[PDB]
Design a protein around this nucleic acid. Structure first.
Length: 42
DNA sequence: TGAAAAGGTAAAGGAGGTCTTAAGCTCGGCTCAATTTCTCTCTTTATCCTGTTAGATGGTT
C-alpha cells in the first residue's frame, strides 16, 4: 500500500476491492486483512 | 576481546501465471437446387444514300 502512495484511510477508501486486488502483489488474503482491520476500526 | 552491523540461508506462505475439464455455441464444408453471366447465332431494326417528270420562276413583317 505504501508503495502505491496510499497514505491515509481516505486514500484506501478511494480504492474498491477490485482496485485493491489490482495492487501489485496484493492478494485476496491481504485484502481480507485490510477489510478486517477496517472492521476493527468500524 | 567483545561487540556492533551487515550479510547470509532455510523456510511458510502468499501471489501469480499456467495449465486441465463440462457446457455451449457457431462455423465451414458439403451437397444440391436454383438459379444470373456469357457467348454464339439470328434477327431486326437504325441510319444513310439515291431518285421523283403536267407546270410552276424576286419576301414579310
Amino acid at each position: 500500500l505504501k508503495r502505491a502512495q496510499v497514505n491515509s484511510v481516505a486514500d484506501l477508501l478511494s480504492y474498491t476491492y477490485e482496485d485493491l486486488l489490482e495492487i501489485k502483489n496484493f492478494g485476496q488474503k491481504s485484502a481480507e486483512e485490510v477489510v478486517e482491520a477496517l472492521e476493527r476500526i468500524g
